[PDB]
Design a binder for this molecule. Structure first.
Ligand SMILES: COc1ccc2cc3[n+](cc2c1OCCC[n+]1cccc2ccccc21)CCc1cc2c(cc1-3)OCO2
Ligand SMILES: *[C@@H]1O[C@H](CO)[C@@H](O)[C@H](O)[C@H]1NC(C)=O
Ligand SMILES: *[C@@H]1O[C@H](CO)[C@@H](O)[C@H](O)[C@H]1NC(C)=O
Length: 572
């Protein structure tokens, strides 16, 4: 039936009041009130530069929006696809089952791509844009997006679509009348790590994830595509790896499917970054090669962090022929990435020390069997693996490794160097390793497990209780986790951050709820690095959750919808 309430801005809060008929004041719908009661309206993330939204809305004819590309170039196909997606972006303002009256002004969207040939991902790419909205004549709106590249331009299309509101009191589609926005991200690497080896994720759910990432301007999908539990990556050159390693014949990622995901990501400004974790985190798929040790070793607690155990045997020269083929097959289909993630997760010495051939190998080279020697074996592996990666990608390119024994800042320079290796950080923001790494010039990606491990909090998956990194991390905590605070003067060496969805307790069915809307908190933290805390983003965070749901994302619920309609009454 008919909406009964209206909202009125009062000290930054939209107050619900009855829509009394005996009033000469025009009623405000909830989101129309929110657009101007809130400092940044309904925007997420909030812009970093100019953020002038004016004071008025204009009624818009949904069928009279037209996008015009003013500069043509190599990104013509990308710009056209982004333009065609803009109307459905706009329709996200309308609740499902509601239809706007097809009246109001016409909208002209002018896209100005000032370097229309640029379309490569790089840490130095220009994601900035300018957004202007103003009345054009009497019956039209002029929205002009100006950006130095396609990626900044499609960010601006995202922000523009957030400047529409549905008046459900009147069934009118509205748009902010006078807008001056300039915007650019604080960090170039704004990512989500998706583990698709501890459990399988449908390609459809991966594309859905990329959709939601683009909606909040995240730009990197780190595809943790192999691990001990499964090998779903279809490597044409070593087919037994996925044939033996896959959980099932249908639970694989073919070349065609990965190409689909990579293209889907490029069109939305998302770099699809593959990882082959090595030399630990291997197992399924390597049967009958004699290239691993400790696979399914028992008791697993004595040999690895979680079952099944298993590590590569770096003393077998055939291993690096396998690795070169894997990396080459990855480079063929992951052909938008400028970076390669090589894992580097903590190696088990007990696993390597229990091997006949490994100990004989270490005798012959004057190595003992102490802790320092197995670190030397790990360095031996990473050097040879790194060479195959360069040959596979046909060029030197940045490589990522996790913080580990190998990348301890006290000895990381022994074989790594800060120009070839980026370090992904799981330690807490107060761990001394971060300061030690930054002073040695290393670049960092923050994935602090106390704020950015999105798998924490659920039940145990071995034994009873809860999983290892519980409690569950609320969005308030991931919002307040600031890399700038963590890095201090070395801020420029922080490339950004990444929410990690490890998947021993997550798959296709839980993907939406694990990531959303919590990854939006990381999106604003990395895009804007606000000096304000989560309380000042709370109202806009509640709205972006609703926008995710309108997109079809099964996003987690944060608060009673009553709180969303009654700002200021839910606090502590
Ligand atoms: C790549 O980083 C990773 C990735 C995966 C990790 C997985 C597990 N564990 C640390 C991990 C880690 O390191 C995170 C640092 C953990 N950690 C360091 C220092 C102090 C701590 C105090 C309290 C809790 C954890 C503290 C901890 C044991 C553990 C037991 C399990 C399990 C998983 C883990 O599944 C079945 O049983
Ligand atoms: C649209 O607005 C932009 C920014 O103010 C302006 O540069 C451009 O000339 C306008 N175009 C039209 C057709 O009004
Ligand atoms: C490796 O095993 C040998 C016995 O085979 C033992 O002497 C040595 O201390 C072990 N080293 C480590 C690091 O466990």
């Amino acid at each position: 039936e008919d909406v009964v309430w209206r909202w009125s801005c009062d000290n930054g809060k939209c107050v619900k009041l009855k829509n009394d008929p005996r009033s000469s004041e025009p009623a405000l719908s909830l989101e129309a009130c929110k657009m101007f009661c809130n400092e940044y309206g309904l925007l997420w993330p909030r812009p970093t530069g100019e953020a002038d939204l004016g004071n008025f809305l204009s009624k818009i004819n949904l069928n009279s929006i037209e996008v015009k590309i003013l500069k043509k170039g190599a990104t013509d196909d990308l710009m056209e696809a982004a333009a065609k997606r803009f109307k459905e972006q706009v329709s996200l303002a309308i609740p499902r089952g509601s239809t706007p009256k097809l009246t109001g002004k016409a909208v002209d969207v002018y896209l100005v791509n000032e370097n229309p040939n640029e379309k490569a991902f790089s840490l130095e790419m220009d994601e900035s844009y300018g957004l202007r909205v103003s009345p054009s004549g009497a019956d039209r709106v002029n929205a002009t997006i100006t950006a130095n590249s396609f990626f900044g331009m499609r960010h601006g299309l995202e922000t523009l679509s957030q400047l529409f509101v549905f008046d459900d009191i009147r069934d009118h589609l509205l748009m902010v009348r006078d807008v001056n926005i300039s915007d650019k991200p604080v960090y170039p690497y704004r990512g989500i790590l998706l583990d698709t080896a501890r459990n399988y994720y449908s390609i459809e759910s991966i594309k859905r994830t990329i959709e939601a990432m683009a909606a909040v301007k995240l730009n990197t999908l780190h595809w943790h595509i192999t691990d001990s539990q499964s090998f779903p990556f279809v490597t044409t050159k070593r087919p037994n790896l996925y044939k033996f390693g896959a959980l099932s014949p249908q639970k694989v990622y073919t070349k065609a499917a990965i190409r689909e995901v990579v293209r889907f990501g490029l069109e939305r400004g998302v770099r699809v970054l593959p990882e082959f974790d090595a030399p630990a985190h291997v197992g399924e798929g390597w049967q009958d090669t004699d290239l691993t040790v400790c696979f399914k070793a028992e008791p697993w607690k004595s040999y690895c962090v979680e079952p099944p155990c298993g590590q590569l045997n770096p003393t077998k020269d055939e291993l690096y022929q396998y690795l070169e083929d894997i990396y080459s097959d990855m480079a063929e289909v992951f052909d938008t990435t400028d970076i390669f993630h090589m894992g580097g997760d903590e190696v088990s010495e007990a696993c390597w020390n229990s091997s006949d051939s490994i100990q004989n190998f270490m005798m012959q080279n004057r190595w003992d069997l102490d802790k320092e020697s197995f670190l030397k074996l790990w360095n031996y592996f990473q050097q040879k693996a790194q060479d195959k990666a360069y040959k596979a990608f046909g060029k030197k390119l940045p490589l990522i490794l996790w913080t580990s024994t190998l990348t301890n800042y006290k000895h990381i320079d022994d074989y790594l160097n800060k120009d070839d290796y980026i370090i992904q950080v799981w330690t807490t923001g107060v761990d001394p390793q971060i300061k030690g790494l930054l002073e040695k010039g290393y670049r960092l990606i923050m994935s602090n497990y106390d704020a950015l491990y999105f798998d924490c909090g659920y039940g145990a998956w071995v034994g009873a209780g809860n999983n290892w990194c519980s409690p569950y991390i609320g969005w308030q905590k991931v919002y307040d986790n600031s890399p700038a605070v963590i890095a201090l003067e070395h801020r420029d060496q922080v490339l950004g951050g990444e929410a990690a969805l490890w998947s021993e307790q997550s798959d296709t069915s839980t993907l939406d709820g694990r990531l959303w809307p919590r990854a939006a908190a990381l999106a604003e933290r990395l895009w804007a690095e606000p000096a304000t805390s989560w309380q000042d983003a709370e109202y806009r965070m509640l709205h972006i959750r609703e926008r995710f749901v309108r997109m079809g994302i099964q996003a987690e619920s944060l608060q009673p919808e009553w709180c969303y309609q009654n700002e200021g009454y839910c606090y502590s």
